[PDB]
Ligand binder design. Structure first.
Ligand SMILES: C[C@@H]1NC(=O)N[C@@H]1CCCCCC(=O)O
Ligand code: NA
Ligand code: NI
Length: 125
């Protein structure tokens, strides 16, 4: 079965109450911070990612992804999440993602290292 720069930049909110603050660069960079409303997390965490900086103009969304490692000055959950999805522009803009969250585990426990979920981001709370 296998601009965005202007549209992605700013603050987004997911269905869990988490907050994403991101700047999209002209050549595909995403940089910013993330504050999770759930899990072993407090305060903001560094976020970095990439997006398609020259997406198709045929009605398709804009592919992107980013990562947060859940370590900051306050806590370290020994885990990292990566969101993969697309930005869909317009009056009801969305970033629709699926997200993998991997914890450091022993080798014996590796089969239960990684969650899969889905987060939908909107520009209004
Ligand atoms: C991926 C989910 N979407 C989200 O906004 N936060 C969740 C992840 C929280 C993980 C916090 C660190 C931990 O508990 O391991
Ligand atoms: Na694993
Ligand atoms: Ni956790």
């Amino acid at each position: 079965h296998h601009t965005a720069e202007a549209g992605i930049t700013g603050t987004w909110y997911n269905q869990l109450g988490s907050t994403l603050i991101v700047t999209a660069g002209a050549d595909g960079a995403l940089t910013g911070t993330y504050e999770s409303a759930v899990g072993n997390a407090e305060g903001s965490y560094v976020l970095t990612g990439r997006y398609d900086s020259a997406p198709a103009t045929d009605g398709s969304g804009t592919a992107l992804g980013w990562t947060v490692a859940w370590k900051n000055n306050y806590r370290n959950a020994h885990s990292a999440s990566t969101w993969s999805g697309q930005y869909v522009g317009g009056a009801e803009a969305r970033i629709n993602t699926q997200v993998l969250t991997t914890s450091g585990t022993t080798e014996a426990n590796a089969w239960k290292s990684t969650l899969v979920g889905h987060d939908t981001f909107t520009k209004v709370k």
